[model samples]
Target: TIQIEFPQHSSSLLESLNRHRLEGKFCDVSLLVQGRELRAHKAVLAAASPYFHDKLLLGDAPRLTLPSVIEADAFEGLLQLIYSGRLRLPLDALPAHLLVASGLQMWQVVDQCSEILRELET
Candidate 1:
């Protein structure tokens, strides 16, 4: 997976999934988890930290536990926009998702969404 959108943003992500994966769906586009469009699903890095350790890392409802729900959805949502070049999220939601993205070090998805949000405003 290239740092920026590559094969799928252009080719592979869609190419590999084109017929075999999305065969039944009727879509000029669709949403799914792209391997390269990653945010942290497992927070080994932040989990080691003492800061996020309370609100995010090791909190009772930690970021790790919330990942499959909280960050996973956000990451997939962001990736969907990246591949489709369409923005569906409300303007306000960008920062919340991006803050999560930065924490996860999902630079590609975070930065791309940030750029999109900025472009939308401009």
Candidate 2:
């Protein structure tokens, strides 16, 4: 096994997703949650979040609606984790973040949040 470092392209993938969102390019699905329609690329969401991956498998519906238990704003924060490595959530939002991260099977974020919570106690 080998490791390669290409700083120039290190963020290319994430940037590409941002590009897609900005121009509304290759956006295949729309999430109708909390009276909002959020568009995104299926491949990107499926690759990053298992929650979407499995849910997407039911059918390639152009639009979807999930439980109101997860607020639209909260879901957006979770989706942000897919584009950026971090979830810009406040301490009070940690519970929602943890739930979303765990549901998505994004263990790295789940662990990171847990560590941060632990550090606060010390």
Candidate 3:
């Protein structure tokens, strides 16, 4: 047997997942933040966030209600970043994003937000 790898496989898969998210297809979880409801895949959330991973283990097709400290918009941005590895938001919102990222234990996003803060300090 021979093994082969596709160079673009990971990115392509992520792109497909993001598209599915946009179309509300095959979403197994619902996240409610500050009255805003966001639908997403449990696998994707569990992969990106320890918080979600632990929370999701409790039930099937769960509807999670995020804490009051987490802003809906910030959570939305975090979800977008998780699915597509891209984050775009106003500079003023980085603090909120950082807070949300920290709560979720998403170190990559936390580091990115920290770096942006350092850049703006100069």
Q: Which stretches of candidate 2 lie over 4 Å from their true place?
A: 1-7
lDDT string for model 2 (10-74, tens) is: 58878888778767888888888788888888888877777788878767888878777767777
Candidate 1 residue lDDT tens string, 1-122: 65664544546544443343234333322222333233332232233323333444334331123333345556655434434434466677787678756765567766787898789889
Worst 10 residues of 2 by lDDT: 80-89
Which structure among the candidates has the greatest TM-score? 3
lDDT of 1: 0.48
Tens-digit lDDT string for candidate 3 (1-122)? 99999999999989999999999999988888999999999998887778888877766656888898889999999889899888899999889989989999988768877998999998
Best by lDDT: 3
Error (Å) of candidate 1 at residue 42 is: 12
Clash totals in order = 3, 0, 0
The reply for model 1, stretches above 4 Å from the true place, is 1-15, 18-73, 79-87, 112-122
Over all chains combined, what TM-score does candidate 1 have?
0.35
Number of the candidate with higher TM-score, 2 or 3 = 3
lDDT, each prediction: 0.48, 0.79, 0.88
Q: Ten-residue segment with the worst summed lDDT in candidate 1?
A: 27-36
